[PDB]
Design a protein around this motif. Structure first.
Motif, short mmCIF file in Angstrom:
data_model
loop_
_atom_site.label_atom_id
_atom_site.label_comp_id
_atom_site.label_asym_id
_atom_site.label_seq_id
_atom_site.Cartn_x
_atom_site.Cartn_y
_atom_site.Cartn_z
N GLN A 95 22.12 -20.44 -14.93
CA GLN A 95 22.23 -21.79 -14.72
C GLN A 95 22.55 -22.55 -16.16
O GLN A 95 21.81 -22.18 -17.05
N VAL A 96 23.69 -23.26 -15.96
CA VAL A 96 24.12 -23.98 -17.58
C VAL A 96 23.70 -25.45 -17.10
O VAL A 96 24.37 -25.76 -16.08
N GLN A 97 23.12 -26.12 -17.82
CA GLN A 97 23.10 -27.48 -17.88
C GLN A 97 23.65 -28.19 -19.02
O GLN A 97 23.34 -27.79 -20.14
N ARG A 98 24.60 -29.25 -18.76
CA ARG A 98 25.24 -29.82 -19.98
C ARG A 98 25.07 -31.36 -19.86
O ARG A 98 25.09 -32.08 -18.80
N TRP A 99 24.74 -32.10 -20.82
CA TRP A 99 24.62 -33.45 -21.03
C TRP A 99 24.80 -33.87 -22.21
O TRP A 99 24.14 -32.99 -23.44
N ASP A 100 25.55 -34.89 -22.61
CA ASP A 100 25.51 -35.55 -24.27
C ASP A 100 26.09 -34.61 -24.89
O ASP A 100 25.61 -34.50 -25.93
N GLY A 101 26.85 -33.59 -24.49
CA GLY A 101 27.44 -32.56 -25.37
C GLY A 101 26.35 -31.52 -25.79
O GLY A 101 26.83 -30.73 -26.72
N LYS A 102 25.18 -31.46 -25.19
CA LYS A 102 24.31 -30.70 -25.28
C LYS A 102 24.25 -29.56 -24.26
O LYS A 102 24.99 -29.88 -23.06
N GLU A 103 23.88 -28.40 -24.32
CA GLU A 103 23.70 -27.40 -23.33
C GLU A 103 22.65 -26.58 -23.35
O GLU A 103 21.99 -26.19 -24.46
N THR A 104 21.92 -26.06 -22.23
CA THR A 104 20.89 -25.28 -22.27
C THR A 104 21.26 -24.50 -20.93
O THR A 104 21.79 -24.66 -20.02
N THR A 105 20.67 -23.12 -21.02
CA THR A 105 20.67 -22.12 -19.89
C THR A 105 19.34 -21.54 -19.67
O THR A 105 18.36 -21.47 -20.17
N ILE A 106 19.39 -21.38 -18.22
CA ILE A 106 18.15 -20.56 -17.62
C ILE A 106 18.65 -19.45 -16.71
O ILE A 106 19.52 -19.64 -15.90
N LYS A 107 18.40 -18.48 -17.00
CA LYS A 107 18.86 -17.16 -16.73
C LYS A 107 17.82 -16.23 -15.80
O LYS A 107 16.72 -16.28 -16.45
N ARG A 108 18.03 -16.11 -14.42
CA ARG A 108 17.02 -15.47 -13.64
C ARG A 108 17.46 -14.45 -13.33
O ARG A 108 18.40 -14.03 -12.56
N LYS A 109 16.69 -13.26 -13.40
CA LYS A 109 16.96 -11.84 -13.11
C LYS A 109 16.08 -11.18 -12.70
O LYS A 109 14.57 -11.77 -12.81
N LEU A 110 16.05 -10.14 -11.73
CA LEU A 110 14.84 -9.34 -10.85
C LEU A 110 14.85 -7.96 -11.88
O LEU A 110 15.61 -7.52 -12.36
N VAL A 111 13.46 -8.01 -12.22
CA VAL A 111 13.25 -6.84 -13.02
C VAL A 111 11.94 -6.02 -12.41
O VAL A 111 10.78 -6.71 -12.73
N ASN A 112 12.13 -4.91 -11.94
CA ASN A 112 10.78 -4.26 -11.34
C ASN A 112 10.27 -5.07 -10.24
O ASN A 112 8.88 -5.05 -10.20
N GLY A 113 10.96 -5.89 -9.54
CA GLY A 113 10.54 -6.43 -8.47
C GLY A 113 9.99 -7.98 -8.87
O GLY A 113 9.49 -8.91 -7.99
#
Ligand SMILES: CCCCCCCCCCCCCCCC(=O)O
Ligand SMILES: [Cl-]
Length: 133
Positions: A95-113
């Motif tokens: 997930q990338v969120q952009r606002w006011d020329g700023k950016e943040t990422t939230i990456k969700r992955k599965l690891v050992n369930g």
């Protein structure tokens, strides 16, 4: 598209460095306290080509729905109005969120369930781990 093993109800069991991440986002103290205390439930569901991520905590709920790869308007838990895009990279739901020329990422992955969420703002990284209920 997204693995079905993402679908279901997830409960936070571990959080690392979330406070400095919220600081990087500009979150105020009162709300940071809420964020550091909360142990949210995250509910991932899918209907047609639309994925929904619903977050529930004692003090705040949020909900987004999106099609993979298609930008959408989002109002975050800390009240940022962003334009967001969720992609899929080698099993990681990003997930990338952009606002006011700023950016943040939230990456969700599965690891050992477990679902591991990496949050990143201006190089500040947090890691939040969820167990499937
Ligand atoms: C339900 C969240 C707690 C409430 C705290 C609100 C202020 C901070 C929220 C901004 C970013 C949240 C990123 C969550 C990532 C995850 O799903 O682990
Ligand atoms: Cl909570």
């Amino acid at each position: 598209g997204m693995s079905n093993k993402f679908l279901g109800t997830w409960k936070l069991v571990s959080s690392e460095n979330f406070d400095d991440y919220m600081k990087a986002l500009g979150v105020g103290l009162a709300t940071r306290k809420l964020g550091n205390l909360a142990k949210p439930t995250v509910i991932i569901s899918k209907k047609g080509d639309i994925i929904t991520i619903r977050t529930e905590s004692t003090a705040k709920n949020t909900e987004i729905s999106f099609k993979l790869g298609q930008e959408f308007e989002e109002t975050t838990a800390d009240n940022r109005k962003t334009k967001s895009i969720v992609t899929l990279q080698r099993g990681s739901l990003n997930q990338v969120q952009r606002w006011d020329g700023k950016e943040t990422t939230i990456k969700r992955k599965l690891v050992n369930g477990k679902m591991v969420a990496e949050c990143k703002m201006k190089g500040v990284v947090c890691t939040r781990i969820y167990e499937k209920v």
